[PDB]
Amino acid sequence: SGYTPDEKLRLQQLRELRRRWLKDQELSPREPVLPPR
Amino acid sequence: GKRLFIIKPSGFYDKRFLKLLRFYILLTGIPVVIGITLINVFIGEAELAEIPEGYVPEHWEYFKHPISRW
């Protein structure tokens, strides 16, 4: 027997939250805003 | 592409301390090094010689380098 459906719901919610966090970890093209030299 | 964010602790304060320490060391290190070079190039070291008869020297005249004599 694998997961309970309760654990499956918890894993799915944590997985989508983690994927949102990792998507937010990316960098916009302006970053880093290095000052002129 | 696909660059990530590298999470690191704030190195601003440590770098600021190192910059301040190097600046405050150099601020008097450069004048003293220039002074030693000017002393050694122009004034220079003393020359060893025998004591003249009837003449007693000062104590600071018993040393070689100008800074040691001073």
PDB file of C-alpha atoms in Angstrom:
ATOM      1  CA  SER A   1       0.000   0.000   0.000  1.00  0.00           C
ATOM      2  CA  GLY A   2       1.351   3.385  -1.051  1.00  0.00           C
ATOM      3  CA  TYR A   3       0.305   6.773   0.279  1.00  0.00           C
ATOM      4  CA  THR A   4      -2.974   7.541   1.918  1.00  0.00           C
ATOM      5  CA  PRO A   5      -5.044  10.074  -0.076  1.00  0.00           C
ATOM      6  CA  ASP A   6      -4.425  12.515   2.784  1.00  0.00           C
ATOM      7  CA  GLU A   7      -0.656  12.197   2.291  1.00  0.00           C
ATOM      8  CA  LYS A   8      -1.122  12.429  -1.484  1.00  0.00           C
ATOM      9  CA  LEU A   9      -2.951  15.744  -1.064  1.00  0.00           C
ATOM     10  CA  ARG A  10      -0.209  17.030   1.249  1.00  0.00           C
ATOM     11  CA  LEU A  11       2.542  15.986  -1.183  1.00  0.00           C
ATOM     12  CA  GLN A  12       0.734  17.584  -4.138  1.00  0.00           C
ATOM     13  CA  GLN A  13       0.253  20.890  -2.298  1.00  0.00           C
ATOM     14  CA  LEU A  14       3.863  20.933  -1.076  1.00  0.00           C
ATOM     15  CA  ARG A  15       5.101  20.061  -4.576  1.00  0.00           C
ATOM     16  CA  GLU A  16       3.217  22.905  -6.252  1.00  0.00           C
ATOM     17  CA  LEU A  17       4.392  25.317  -3.528  1.00  0.00           C
ATOM     18  CA  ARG A  18       7.989  24.133  -4.027  1.00  0.00           C
ATOM     19  CA  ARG A  19       7.726  24.524  -7.804  1.00  0.00           C
ATOM     20  CA  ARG A  20       6.395  28.067  -7.354  1.00  0.00           C
ATOM     21  CA  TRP A  21       9.325  28.850  -5.035  1.00  0.00           C
ATOM     22  CA  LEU A  22      11.874  27.433  -7.488  1.00  0.00           C
ATOM     23  CA  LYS A  23      10.252  29.413 -10.313  1.00  0.00           C
ATOM     24  CA  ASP A  24      10.593  32.545  -8.174  1.00  0.00           C
ATOM     25  CA  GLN A  25      14.285  31.709  -7.649  1.00  0.00           C
ATOM     26  CA  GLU A  26      15.056  32.751 -11.249  1.00  0.00           C
ATOM     27  CA  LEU A  27      16.667  36.038 -12.304  1.00  0.00           C
ATOM     28  CA  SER A  28      15.153  38.824 -14.371  1.00  0.00           C
ATOM     29  CA  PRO A  29      17.425  40.052 -17.212  1.00  0.00           C
ATOM     30  CA  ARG A  30      18.169  43.385 -15.503  1.00  0.00           C
ATOM     31  CA  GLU A  31      19.471  41.606 -12.402  1.00  0.00           C
ATOM     32  CA  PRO A  32      22.134  42.042 -11.202  1.00  0.00           C
ATOM     33  CA  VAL A  33      22.075  45.856 -11.449  1.00  0.00           C
ATOM     34  CA  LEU A  34      25.815  46.426 -11.569  1.00  0.00           C
ATOM     35  CA  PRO A  35      26.837  50.085 -11.196  1.00  0.00           C
ATOM     36  CA  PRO A  36      28.804  51.781 -13.991  1.00  0.00           C
ATOM     37  CA  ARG A  37      32.584  51.897 -13.735  1.00  0.00           C
TER      38      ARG A  37
ATOM     39  CA  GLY B   1      20.007  31.931 -19.765  1.00  0.00           C
ATOM     40  CA  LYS B   2      18.154  30.199 -16.879  1.00  0.00           C
ATOM     41  CA  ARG B   3      20.353  31.880 -14.267  1.00  0.00           C
ATOM     42  CA  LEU B   4      19.488  31.152 -10.639  1.00  0.00           C
ATOM     43  CA  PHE B   5      19.879  33.166  -7.453  1.00  0.00           C
ATOM     44  CA  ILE B   6      22.931  32.175  -5.409  1.00  0.00           C
ATOM     45  CA  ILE B   7      22.039  32.762  -1.758  1.00  0.00           C
ATOM     46  CA  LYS B   8      25.081  33.886   0.231  1.00  0.00           C
ATOM     47  CA  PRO B   9      25.574  35.847   3.460  1.00  0.00           C
ATOM     48  CA  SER B  10      26.057  39.598   3.263  1.00  0.00           C
ATOM     49  CA  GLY B  11      29.713  40.201   2.434  1.00  0.00           C
ATOM     50  CA  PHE B  12      29.313  43.985   2.423  1.00  0.00           C
ATOM     51  CA  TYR B  13      30.361  44.515   6.047  1.00  0.00           C
ATOM     52  CA  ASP B  14      33.458  42.296   5.909  1.00  0.00           C
ATOM     53  CA  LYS B  15      34.590  43.896   2.643  1.00  0.00           C
ATOM     54  CA  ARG B  16      33.990  47.331   4.175  1.00  0.00           C
ATOM     55  CA  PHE B  17      36.146  46.393   7.173  1.00  0.00           C
ATOM     56  CA  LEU B  18      38.942  45.141   4.910  1.00  0.00           C
ATOM     57  CA  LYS B  19      38.813  48.322   2.808  1.00  0.00           C
ATOM     58  CA  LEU B  20      38.917  50.494   5.938  1.00  0.00           C
ATOM     59  CA  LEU B  21      41.816  48.520   7.436  1.00  0.00           C
ATOM     60  CA  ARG B  22      43.884  48.678   4.243  1.00  0.00           C
ATOM     61  CA  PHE B  23      43.161  52.400   3.826  1.00  0.00           C
ATOM     62  CA  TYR B  24      44.048  53.279   7.418  1.00  0.00           C
ATOM     63  CA  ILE B  25      47.238  51.210   7.276  1.00  0.00           C
ATOM     64  CA  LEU B  26      48.308  52.723   3.944  1.00  0.00           C
ATOM     65  CA  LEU B  27      47.444  56.307   4.984  1.00  0.00           C
ATOM     66  CA  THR B  28      50.548  56.383   7.171  1.00  0.00           C
ATOM     67  CA  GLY B  29      52.391  53.482   5.521  1.00  0.00           C
ATOM     68  CA  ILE B  30      53.014  55.444   2.321  1.00  0.00           C
ATOM     69  CA  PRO B  31      54.493  58.530   4.123  1.00  0.00           C
ATOM     70  CA  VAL B  32      56.796  56.441   6.325  1.00  0.00           C
ATOM     71  CA  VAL B  33      58.037  54.369   3.361  1.00  0.00           C
ATOM     72  CA  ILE B  34      58.637  57.562   1.361  1.00  0.00           C
ATOM     73  CA  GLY B  35      60.475  59.009   4.363  1.00  0.00           C
ATOM     74  CA  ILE B  36      62.732  55.967   4.762  1.00  0.00           C
ATOM     75  CA  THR B  37      63.552  55.971   1.035  1.00  0.00           C
ATOM     76  CA  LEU B  38      64.371  59.693   1.113  1.00  0.00           C
ATOM     77  CA  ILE B  39      66.532  59.223   4.224  1.00  0.00           C
ATOM     78  CA  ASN B  40      68.475  56.344   2.685  1.00  0.00           C
ATOM     79  CA  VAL B  41      68.902  57.879  -0.781  1.00  0.00           C
ATOM     80  CA  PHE B  42      70.000  61.414   0.117  1.00  0.00           C
ATOM     81  CA  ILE B  43      71.226  61.518   3.725  1.00  0.00           C
ATOM     82  CA  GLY B  44      72.389  57.906   3.806  1.00  0.00           C
ATOM     83  CA  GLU B  45      74.181  55.877   6.434  1.00  0.00           C
ATOM     84  CA  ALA B  46      77.191  56.904   8.496  1.00  0.00           C
ATOM     85  CA  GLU B  47      80.803  55.860   7.919  1.00  0.00           C
ATOM     86  CA  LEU B  48      82.846  54.019  10.534  1.00  0.00           C
ATOM     87  CA  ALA B  49      86.014  55.774  11.690  1.00  0.00           C
ATOM     88  CA  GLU B  50      88.402  55.785  14.626  1.00  0.00           C
ATOM     89  CA  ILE B  51      87.907  58.208  17.511  1.00  0.00           C
ATOM     90  CA  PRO B  52      89.999  61.379  17.060  1.00  0.00           C
ATOM     91  CA  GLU B  53      92.456  62.137  19.833  1.00  0.00           C
ATOM     92  CA  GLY B  54      91.167  64.534  22.474  1.00  0.00           C
ATOM     93  CA  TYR B  55      87.627  64.364  21.053  1.00  0.00           C
ATOM     94  CA  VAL B  56      84.817  62.550  22.846  1.00  0.00           C
ATOM     95  CA  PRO B  57      81.638  61.799  20.863  1.00  0.00           C
ATOM     96  CA  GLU B  58      78.020  61.993  21.879  1.00  0.00           C
ATOM     97  CA  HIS B  59      76.186  58.764  22.653  1.00  0.00           C
ATOM     98  CA  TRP B  60      73.892  59.121  19.626  1.00  0.00           C
ATOM     99  CA  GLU B  61      77.016  59.437  17.458  1.00  0.00           C
ATOM    100  CA  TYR B  62      77.825  55.790  18.245  1.00  0.00           C
ATOM    101  CA  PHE B  63      75.148  54.486  15.842  1.00  0.00           C
ATOM    102  CA  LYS B  64      74.920  54.065  12.083  1.00  0.00           C
ATOM    103  CA  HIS B  65      71.445  54.721  10.677  1.00  0.00           C
ATOM    104  CA  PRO B  66      70.068  58.299  10.852  1.00  0.00           C
ATOM    105  CA  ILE B  67      66.787  57.135  12.384  1.00  0.00           C
ATOM    106  CA  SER B  68      68.622  55.195  15.103  1.00  0.00           C
ATOM    107  CA  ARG B  69      70.755  58.271  15.832  1.00  0.00           C
ATOM    108  CA  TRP B  70      67.621  60.436  15.971  1.00  0.00           C
TER     109      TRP B  70
END
